[PDB]
């Protein structure tokens, strides 16, 4: 019923990020998948994009270089594999957590699990990107 529910292995390199990583998710094309995270997820098989998404945030929870920019409560969220909450001004109603976005649309044949085709966005920016 959706292409994102077909199994696949994660691929791609990601990019270096700094402490402003999630701040960047509210801007432009969204933030890249951190190269550090991509290193750990590459070649793992996921049964769906939602399982890949859980894995991204679990890896964030385990990487002190990235988790240090989350407060205690958001650390709790990612420890469960949940997406962390964005600042209130980046939320849109019931969409309050960071969202994964595909730079090239899956509809146009963009890759579901290639992390070079994935970005981290805030709800506000994600809605705006798709227009």
């Amino acid at each position: 019923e959706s292409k994102r529910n077909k199994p696949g292995k994660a691929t791609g390199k990601g990019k270096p990020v700094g402490d402003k990583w999630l701040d960047d998710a509210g801007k432009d094309s969204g933030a890249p998948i951190p190269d550090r995270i991509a290193d750990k997820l590459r070649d793992k098989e996921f049964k769906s994009f939602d399982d890949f998404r859980k894995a991204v945030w679990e890896e964030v929870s385990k990487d002190p270089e990235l988790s240090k920019n989350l407060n205690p409560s958001n650390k709790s969220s990612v420890s469960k594999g949940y997406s962390p909450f964005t600042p209130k001004n980046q939320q849109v109603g019931g969409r309050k957590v960071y969202e994964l976005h595909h730079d090239k649309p899956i509809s146009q044949g963009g890759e579901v699990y290639d992390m070079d085709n994935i970005r981290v966005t805030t709800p506000k920016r994600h809605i705006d990107i798709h227009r």
């Binding site: 407060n71 409560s73 958001n74 709790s76 962390p84 600042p87 209130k88 019931g94 309050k96």
Partner: protein, 83 residues
Amino acid sequence: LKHSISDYTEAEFLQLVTTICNADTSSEEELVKLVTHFAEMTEHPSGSDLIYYPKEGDDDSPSGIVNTVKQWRAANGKSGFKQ
């Protein structure tokens, strides 16, 4: 028990905040709904930022958050907890 903060004793509200701060839910969806409810209950301008993006020098432990809510509502003409 779900409609406004005067429906919560301070202890019950602390339970809600503790649940959120611990992400003590079996799904992300549940947690987000709890956070939305929190923001609606407190009526605080910061919304969920009280929990996830504290002002400098604000205590973001569960009890710290409950105290920040309690003091703000007290200072801004709003009703307080039950009991």
